[PDB]
Assembly symmetry: C2
């Protein structure tokens, strides 16, 4: 679908209220094409219409939209257009979509502002309670080790930082099986101890604010006494039962740039649907997301896993502002993937038919994620602007 979008025969430019369609057809007039347009406010549709295309080979058609809806709510307005073929051809069904494009419109920042959770401290854990909800942080590891909704545990594995991905074919960088390239990303990551780095708890404290409990932690990931990454987090549980997580990570400049900077955990719940507000229905990465569209998407959980025959990191969606799975909701500006297969099982399994579903649901929430490359598959092919080389990173997420 990335190839279909980049290769599409109509190109679009937006000025303000006017769309400029340019045909890349050299010989035919656009005699089987209808331009659908839509405006939505964070997935919520507000207006839409249709205009027949009538553009010559290599010509242009100007399309003046009407006076757009100016919503009062906060949020980002998005314009999506799609060229649709109403009649069948020899090679396509009726209603075939041949080209599309999306733009941001006006944005309205939210200036609207939104009992007391109890902190019970023991030697092994910090336990926070608010009504039927409870959060437990382990004081030796420093991670959120468990949550309860009523009497139901929600986590099977703690919520911990993750800096690695199950390596892609472009990460492995091998065209002949007898030749291993030491400049490949997987060889650099393994030799630098990214797949074996152990965190050291540097700080784990808790305190009671006027309307919330703040947990502050710091971890250092080390391999043979070299500190690869440092992660400083604050967990802020308010009175509404929301958990605001703020993450600041430092990456050593002489280690290879990590594949990802995020969090992962295994949820106890297995649900049927994943619903979320972000880019595209299909799997998209930072190097390959032009074909995806910002909208509210809803798919079965098996649609969130891409069954590549050689298993690897898969199914990521970028540009996501909100994610719903079971009773949980995550808000922020992140990339996620969600599946029944951990990253460790993906890396250790050579064929997709040998994968088995694990007990819960593995969630990978990424602040930042490396590009996937693909100029070739036998040398490093991620551009320098798609690598995680900034040295210091920051993201924030709101659970509930």
């Amino acid at each position: 679908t990335e190839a279909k979008h980049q290769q599409q025969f109509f190109q679009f430019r937006l000025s303000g209220q006017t769309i400029e369609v340019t045909s890349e057809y050299l010989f035919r007039h656009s005699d089987n094409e209808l331009l659908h347009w839509m405006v939505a406010l964070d997935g919520k549709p507000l207006a839409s219409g249709e205009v027949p295309l009538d553009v010559a080979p290599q010509g242009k058609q100007l399309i003046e939209l009407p006076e757009l809806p100016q919503p009062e709510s906060a949020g980002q307005l998005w314009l999506t257009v799609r060229v649709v073929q109403p009649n069948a051809t020899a090679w396509s069904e009726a209603g075939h979509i041949s080209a599309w494009q999306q733009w941001r419109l006006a944005e309205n920042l939210s200036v609207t502002l939104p009992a007391i959770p109890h902190l019970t401290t023991s030697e092994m854990d910090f336990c926070i309670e608010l009504g039927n909800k409870r959060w437990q942080f382990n004081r030796q590891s420093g991670f959120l080790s468990q949550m309860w909704i009523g009497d139901k545990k929600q986590l099977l594995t703690p919520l911990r930082d993750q800096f690695t991905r199950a390596p892609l074919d472009n990460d492995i960088g091998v065209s002949e099986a007898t030749r291993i390239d030491p400049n490949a990303w997987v060889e650099r990551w393994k030799a630098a101890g990214h797949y074996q780095a152990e965190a050291a708890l540097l700080q784990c404290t808790a305190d009671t604010l006027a309307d919330a409990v703040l947990i502050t932690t710091a971890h250092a990931w080390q391999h043979q006494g070299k500190t690869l990454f440092i992660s400083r987090k604050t967990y802020r549980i308010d009175g509404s039962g929301q958990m605001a997580i703020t993450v600041d990570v430092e990456v050593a400049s002489d280690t290879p740039h990590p594949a990802r900077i995020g969090l992962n955990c295994q949820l106890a719940q297995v649900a049927e649907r994943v619903n979320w507000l972000g880019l595209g229905p299909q799997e998209n990465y930072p190097d390959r997301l032009t074909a995806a569209c910002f909208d509210r998407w809803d798919l079965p959980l098996s649609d969130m896993y891409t069954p590549y025959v050689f298993p690897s990191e898969n199914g990521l969606r970028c540009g996501t502002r909100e994610l719903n799975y079971g009773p949980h909701q995550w808000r922020g500006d992140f990339q996620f993937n969600i599946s029944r297969y951990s990253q460790q099982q993906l890396m250790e399994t050579s064929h997709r038919h040998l994968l088995h579903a694990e007990e819960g649901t593995w969630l990978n929430i990424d602040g930042f994620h490396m590009g996937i490359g693909g100029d070739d598959s036998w040398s490093p092919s991620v551009s320098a602007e798609l690598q995680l080389s900034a040295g210091r990173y920051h993201y924030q997420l709101v659970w509930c």
Copy 2:
């Protein structure tokens, strides 16, 4: 929002501001000021920029210090004025210059004297640590914009400090059309920086 609370070893101040022009919210700034027991003030800043406003020239803090000192000492890029679009000639090192060397006397006055890539800044008894760009002078940004000739500038009462988390490129492919590349514009929508003032 403006609240305060006592932690186990520090005082935390949390604020939020919205910048508006005719009911349009341009930017939102959320800050936390965390004063520990060692007398350090850790400032954390998160800013949201409206995507349909033009990208701002800078995202930072400014203030006028009462002190006027003779030297500026600092750990960052180059001795001379450098910007994100023009910093390849500068070197990371510990630099020390007179305060008049921190101002570039362009004949038509403008924003000048920025140093990028800076990890620590010393001026008088103050020290700032982080990863920022700064400029420091006796001339505010308002006086620079309102003065057509450099000889009409006069030194203000203290020292104006501009500490920038982020700063736009300066362009220069030509001077009569917009010439900053898209990677040098502040178009990310959400920004974050942190500074320690001791």
